[PDB]
Amino acid sequence: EMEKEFEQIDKSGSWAAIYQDIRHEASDFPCRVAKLPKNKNRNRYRDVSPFDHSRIKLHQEDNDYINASLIKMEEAQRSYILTQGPLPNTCGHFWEMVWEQKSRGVVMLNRVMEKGSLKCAQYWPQKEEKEMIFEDTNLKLTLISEDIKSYYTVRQLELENLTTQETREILHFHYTTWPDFGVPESPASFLNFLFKVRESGSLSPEHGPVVVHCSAGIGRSGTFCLADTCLLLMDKRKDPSSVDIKKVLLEMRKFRMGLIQTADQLRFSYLAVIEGAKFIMGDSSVQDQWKELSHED
């Protein structure tokens, strides 16, 4: 059981060892498509690639490759697409994927510039009157509105298939204060944001999988998805004791490499799930407490 295990790991000072065990046991599957020479400029990082078996294939229509993986959580009955921050030449591919996969939400856990470097393209419009046209993939993208909070921003976007003139509302949830290889400021700030995504209906099984990304689409993205799936599993069962966090992480790692990048991110995941369980198991009042503690205003 996770809280008893947490205390034992904390007491014995063994987060590094627990995390290394996970790394040791994690799946290794081929990424042959990712490593084709023609795809070199579609990958942000040499050593971060989607496995062939779970890669998202684009439907157009000359080269189907995008650095993005379908994390299909069978027991939980929820799926996520985890992807790298799009590059200057892959923003059209990114939105093509959102359209084809029928996603309603995009969760962004990084900033465009981190540590002086460009870790993600400016792939969405920052001003209503300056829409983006992706001529390669025949899509238009317009900012409809935004709600700016202290550490996150929610945007309403309209994505249009220029081929058909069909339009869809996409919700963009941008966590702006999650440092690379680091953790959220508190369980409360993380959970307040996760519940904002949940409340939107973006994780509904009636939609395609939410797209989640950071810069590599593994560390911060893995942490987010691990906490969400653990919370969902205990919710379905109304049984916190039924959830084996390490097992869930290993299951996710069947679908994309390197999910959760540090031992402290693993530790934070346990904290987030232990805290979130208070809400799942019926202390409704904790949600307001997280909102207050997050200082979102």
Site for ligand SK2 in 120-179 (CB under 6 A): none
CB of 240 or CB of 246, closer to Cl ion: 246
Using CB distances below 5 to 8 A depending on partner kind, what does residue 216 bind out of ligand SK2, Cl ion, none? ligand SK2
Under the criterion CB under 6 A, does residue 42 sit at the interface with ligand SK2?
no
Q: How far apart are CA 168 and CA 158, in angstroms?
A: 6
165 is in an annotated binding site: no
- Select from 180, 185, 235, 264 the one that contacts ligand SK2 (CB under 6 A): 180
| 268 vs 252: CA distance, rounded Å | 17
**Interaction pattern, residues 238-267, with Cl ion; x per rule: CB under 5 A:** --------------------x---------
Among Cl ion, ligand SK2, none, what binds residue 179 when CB lies within 5 to 8 Å by partner kind? Cl ion
Tell which one of 8, 179, 199, 201 touches Cl ion (CB under 5 A). Answer: 179
Helix (H, G, I), strand (E, B) or coil at 16: helix
Contact call for residue 183 and ligand SK2 (CB under 6 A): no
* Interface with Cl ion, residue 180, by CB under 5 A: yes
**Which entry of 31, 120, 214, 225 is annotated as an active-site residue?**
214
Residue 188 makes CB contacts below 8 A (sequence gap 6+) with: 275, 289, 290, 293, 294
Q: Tokens 């003139």, residue?
A: 165
AA letter at 63? N
Cβ contacts of residue 273 below 8 Å, gap of 6+? 2, 226, 227, 230, 231, 234, 243, 245
Known active-site residue 214 = yes
> CA-to-CA distance for 173 and 199, rounded, in angstroms?
12
Here's the x/- map for ligand SK2, 88-127, by CB under 6 A: it reads as ----------------------x-----------------
Query: Minimal distance in Å, beta carbon 117 to Cl ion?
Result: 8
261 binds ligand SK2 (CB under 6 A): yes
Cβ count near 201 (within 10 Å):
12
Helix 263-280 × helix 219-237 angle, to 10° = 30
Residue 152 phi/psi, 5-degree rounding, is -155, 160
Does 220 bind ligand SK2 (CB under 6 A)? Our answer is yes
- Could you list the residues known to form a binding site for substrate, using ranges: 180, 214-220, 261
Q: Which residues are catalytic?
A: 214
